[PDB]
């Protein structure tokens with residue numbers, strides 16, 4: 001009977017919440033975040049070696065930036081450009097040299113290697129950095145790079 | 152019948168979100184945000200020339216700080232004071248000298264000019280900065296000022 | 303038709319719950335910590351006690367006030383991450399030797415380093431927490447990491 005009115009009432013609160021949430025999300029991502037589809041990149045704004053970077057992201061309930069399409073890569077590139085610091089991706093070929101995988105162990109479904117890469121320089125480049133131009137380069141995991149997590 | 156129970160269950164989930172979100176709004180706005188009415192100012196925490204500052208805000212889905220009332224201007228001032236750095240506003244008289252407009256092209260509905268301003272010093276001041284005392288001054292767009300966006 | 307509107311409302315709420323949960327993770331990284339119903343967040347810079355206290359209150363919160371081992375460990379994470387000791391909210395400004403919260407009540411938990419509090423130089427009324435989580439009374443005029451709780 002009057003249930004129709006409890007429906008409309010709830011409709012109002014939900015919609016006011018949707019509106020405030022949309023506003024607060026835009027505010028949240030400025031200036032250190034970028035959303036693309038259902039994924040959100042956020043940079044910590046400082047550099048760390050791979051192991052440390054990876055730990056910061058996992059402990060925060062996410063993982064290191066893992067661009068899976070050209071659209072995701074471009075979104076990530078924006079933060080790298082904004083900070084003017086190359087960043088680590090999540091992917092490594094530590095298990096089997098030459099075969100880059102995501103943290104889950106799955107093979108890459110997208111790549112944006114710079115010309116000549118990956119080249120395993122010095123016989124010891126198992127992590128991946130993304131440059132300000134959005135291209136990728138395998139690099140030693142001990143180097144320090146911008147920390148960007150995805151959620 | 153069962154529809155009544157469903158609506159009641161949603162009401163409880165909504166209440167939970169509302170309370171939880173209320174807390175996160177405060178957390179998020181600390182220390183670089185300022186809420187006033189339905190507007191939110193947030194500083195990027197660094198300085199840029201007007202053109203770069205404007206692009207940052209627009210690409211983030213907002214625009215440069217545009218106080219439209221004394222209340223908004225006072226809220227913006229609080230951030231500026233806290234960061235101890237003058238900030239750009241969105242408004243310019245780049246189109247017609249002496250006529251300041253918002254990015255939308257509409258004339259100012261509020262202003263807080265320091266005495267004697269705007270004065271187009273050197274014949275080349277088309278942007279606007281807000282001081283820590285909350286007053287406005289027209290200024291060369293090439294200068295670097297604190298980036299504060301509104302959402 | 304009411305049952306169809308309820309279904310749409312159900313969808314909206316499930317979507318909001320999922321988005322809010324994702325958003326919380328984003329907000330807390332890298333400067334916040336959630337413990338129980340409390341959230342610590344660092345401003346990422348240092349200030350003297352009075353200015354730090356003002357920043358927190360103006361933002362609708364207060365300075366870090368760990369009231370249990372669990373809260374202290376969470377706060378400790380931010381301190382370690384920034385590698386900067388932080389001010390707590392508590393002081394014995396009113397009565398030497400009796401530390402109190404901003405409300406005025408006495409401490410209900412403490413984690414003092416060995417030998418502390420010692421009012422060194424006869425003038426230490428504020429509290430700092432080290433990277434090791436232990437507390438030391440310290441001069442309020444020193445500059446320490448600002449960490450608020452909400």
Ligand SMILES: OC[C@H]1O[C@H](O[C@H]2[C@@H](O)[C@H](O)[C@@H](CO)O[C@@H]2O)[C@@H](O)[C@@H](O)[C@@H]1O
Pocket residue numbers: 117119121125137138139
């Ligand atoms: O240091 C490992 C790195 O060396 C080479 O790249 C270097 C240089 O040639 C490049 O111009 C700059 C800018 O990209 O980076 C390094 O200084 C390459 O062999 C590269 O594959 C390798 O990872």
Ligand SMILES: OC[C@H]1O[C@H](O[C@H]2[C@@H](O)[C@H](O)[C@@H](CO)O[C@@H]2O)[C@@H](O)[C@@H](O)[C@@H]1O
Pocket residue numbers: 268270272276288289290
């Ligand atoms: O330099 C442009 C600026 O010059 C004059 O303002 C001076 C001073 O009075 C102001 O407080 C500071 C603020 O940064 O700038 C100058 O030092 C005025 O002519 C002013 O209108 C003008 O924009």
Ligand SMILES: OC[C@H]1O[C@H](O[C@H]2[C@@H](O)[C@H](O)[C@@H](CO)O[C@@H]2O)[C@@H](O)[C@@H](O)[C@@H]1O
Pocket residue numbers: 418420422426432438439440
């Ligand atoms: O007066 C400041 C402070 O001095 C002493 O503590 C110092 C040092 O002894 C400790 O190793 C480190 C711990 O990280 O803290 C200070 O640097 C103590 O006398 C202490 O009570 C006092 O507040």
Ligand SMILES: [Ca+2]
Pocket residue numbers: 093094097123124125126
């Ligand atoms: Ca290898």
Ligand SMILES: [Ca+2]
Pocket residue numbers: 093097098120124125126127138
């Ligand atoms: Ca390799």
Ligand SMILES: [Ca+2]
Pocket residue numbers: 117118119120121125137138139
């Ligand atoms: Ca390489």
Ligand SMILES: [Ca+2]
Pocket residue numbers: 244245248274275276277
């Ligand atoms: Ca002009």
Ligand SMILES: [Ca+2]
Pocket residue numbers: 244248249271275276277278289
């Ligand atoms: Ca002018």
Ligand SMILES: [Ca+2]
Pocket residue numbers: 268269270271272276288289290
């Ligand atoms: Ca001027």
Ligand SMILES: [Ca+2]
Pocket residue numbers: 394395398424425426427
């Ligand atoms: Ca004393």
Ligand SMILES: [Ca+2]
Pocket residue numbers: 394398399421425426427428439
């Ligand atoms: Ca004392």
Ligand SMILES: [Ca+2]
Pocket residue numbers: 418419420421422426438439440
């Ligand atoms: Ca002491």
